Each structure stands twice: as structure tokens, then as C-alpha cells.
Amino acid sequence: MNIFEMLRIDEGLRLKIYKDTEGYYTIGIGHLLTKSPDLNAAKSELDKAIGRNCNGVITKDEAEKLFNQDVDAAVRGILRNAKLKPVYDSLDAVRRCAAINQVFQMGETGVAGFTNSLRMLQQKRWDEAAVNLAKSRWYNQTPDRAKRVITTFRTGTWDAYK
Numbered sequence: 176m177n178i179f180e181m182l183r184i185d186e187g188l189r190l191k192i193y194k195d196t197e198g199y200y201t202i203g204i205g206h207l208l209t210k211s212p213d214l215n216a217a218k219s220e221l222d223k224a225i226g227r228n229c230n231g232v233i234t235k236d237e238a239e240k241l242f243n244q245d246v247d248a249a250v251r252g253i254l255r256n257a258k259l260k261p262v263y264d265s266l267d268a269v270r271r272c273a274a275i276n277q278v279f280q281m282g283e284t285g286v287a288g289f290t291n292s293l294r295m296l297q298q299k300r301w302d303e304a305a306v307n308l309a310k311s312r313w314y315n316q317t318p319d320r321a322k323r324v325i326t327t328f329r330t331g332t333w334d335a336y337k
């Protein structure tokens with residue numbers, strides 16, 4: 176297991192424009208196109224992202240290319256963020272994957288609400304952190320995925336991903 180395999184499980188792979196769990200147009204392996212309800216705006220974002228007229232459909236290789244860009248940018252964003260970097264760098268590599276997963280899903284603005292959890296994670300109070308992480312809109316809206324990510328934060332193992 177690694178961050179790619181982990182996110183592939185949590186996000187799936189779809190080659191045609193679909194709506195994510197929040198109702199937002201998306202493609203590939205959780206590549207958000209736009210929060211706009213305009214399908215045409217979504218198709219334009221897709222064409223911009225791929226560099227060709229896709230008419231709402233991409234290939235597996237194209238999906239994987241966006242995925243690599245998205246994972247990389249998520250990590251680089253964490254490192255640029257003064258509130259996230261110290262906590263991230265305090266973690267072991269497996270727990271860092273849980274961090275990347277969380278930011279990939281909810282963005283840095285979503286993780287902004289997790290200040291208290293992040294503190295407990297930095298303190299390595301793993302059971303307390305796990306309890307605090309579940310007291311969230313995140314957990315209530317996507318509980319089965321959040322349970323896996325939280326188990327990863329709690330244990331520093333990949334037990335939840337097989």
C-alpha cells in the first residue's frame with residue numbers, strides 16, 4: 176500500500192464526468208473539475224486540464240496523469256501551509272498518507288476546521304485524535320471512508336486498506 180493505491184480505493188476511477196459525493200462535477204480518480212452546477216463549465220475545465228477537446232470523456236492514462244498532478248500538488252500545499260507543515264512533518268510515513276488523503280478530499284480549507292485533531296496528532300495522542308476526528312461533518316457525510324482514514328491516523332498501519 177501507498178498513497179496512490181490508498182486514494183485509488185477511496186476515490187475510484189471513472190472515465191466520464193460524474194458528480195462526487197458533494198454533487199460536484201469530477202472525473203478520473205477524484206479530480207474535481209468545478210463546484211459550478213453548469214455542466215458546460217465542467218467540460219471546459221476538463222478540456223483545459225487535459226489540453227484537448229474531450230467532450231466529457233478521458234482515458235485511463237489521462238486519469239492517472241491528473242491523479243499524479245493532484246497528489247503532488249496536495250503534498251506541496253501541505254508543505255507551504257504554516258498550520259499543516261509542522262504536524263505533517265511530525266508524523267511517520269503511513270500517517271502522512273492519511274494526511275494527504277484528508278487534504279485531497281476536503282482541501283486545506285476543510286482541514287482548517289481540524290485544528291484540535293491536528294494538535295492531538297502532533298502530540299501523538301492517537302486514540303484521542305481518532306475520537307476527535309470522527310466528531311465532524313467529514314465523518315458524518317462519508318463515514319466509511321473517514322473510518323479508514325481515521326484508523327490509519329490511529330494505528331500508523333494499513334489495516335483499514337485490506
Ligand SMILES: Cc1ccccc1O
Nearest residue numbers: 259262263274277278
Ligand atoms: C493536512 C494534514 C496534516 C496533518 C494531519 C492531518 C492533515 O489532514
